[PDB]
Every structure is written in structure tokens, then in C-alpha cells.
Amino acid sequence: QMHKDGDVYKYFSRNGYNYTDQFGASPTEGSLTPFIHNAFKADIQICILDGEMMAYNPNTQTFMQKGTKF
DNA sequence: AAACATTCGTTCACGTGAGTTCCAGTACAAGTCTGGTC
């Protein structure tokens, strides 16, 4: 689950553990935020979202199911 | 005028429906143990 306020991002797991270190707390750093920051529309500054985090292979353009690996 | 049959209000036993308490079956939620990898 992702919390967004302006340029500030925060991520939480199923049981409540912080994961912002991995996914980035600002567009300058991270593994997802620098690329998803510009996806949001002009009028949206505060947001809470819930979803799944997955691994994507661009070569085959396919989701790699995280059975137990990668 | 006397004897026998019938009828009536009473009595007991037995059966059936509704209320109450107790326990078993069911459901759901949380806890505990386990598995696999990166």
C-alpha cells in the first residue's frame, strides 16, 4: 500500500512493515518511484493506493510469477 | 307390588400440545506449527 503527499511517498506491507527504503521515498531514489512519479494526473497530490508488487520481464513483456524466486 | 334394564353425573387412566432447561452440532476467528526461496 502506497501513501503519497506531494513529493513524499511511503510504502507499507501486509503486516505493516515499512518498505520505503526499497521502493523510494522521493523521485530522486528508489526502484519504482522515479518512474511512477509522473504517471499521476495534475490535480492529484494526496493519494492512498492498495495493490500488488510484481516482477516484470520486458524482453518477453510478461509478469514473472514470484513462486519463490527472483 | 317387586325385579330388571337404562341413564346420568362421577371417577380414573392414558394420550397429546406448549413452555422451560440443558447439551451437542455448527460457524467463525485467532493462535500455533510448518514450508519454500531470496
- Within 7 Å of a protein beta carbon, the nucleotides of strand B are 35-38
Q: How far is the CA of A16 from the C1' of B28 (A)?
A: 25
Report the b/e string of A41-68 with b at 16+ CB within 10 A.
Answer: eeeeeeeeeeeeeeeeeeeeeeeeeeee
Q: How far is the CA of A29 from the C1' of B33 (A)?
A: 40
Q: A29 φ, ψ to 5°?
A: -135, 165
Experimental method: cryo-EM
A41 is in an annotated binding site: no
Angle at A52 between CA A61 and CA A47, to 5 degrees: 115
A10 is in an annotated binding site: no
Range list of H helices, A1-70: 20-23, 33-36
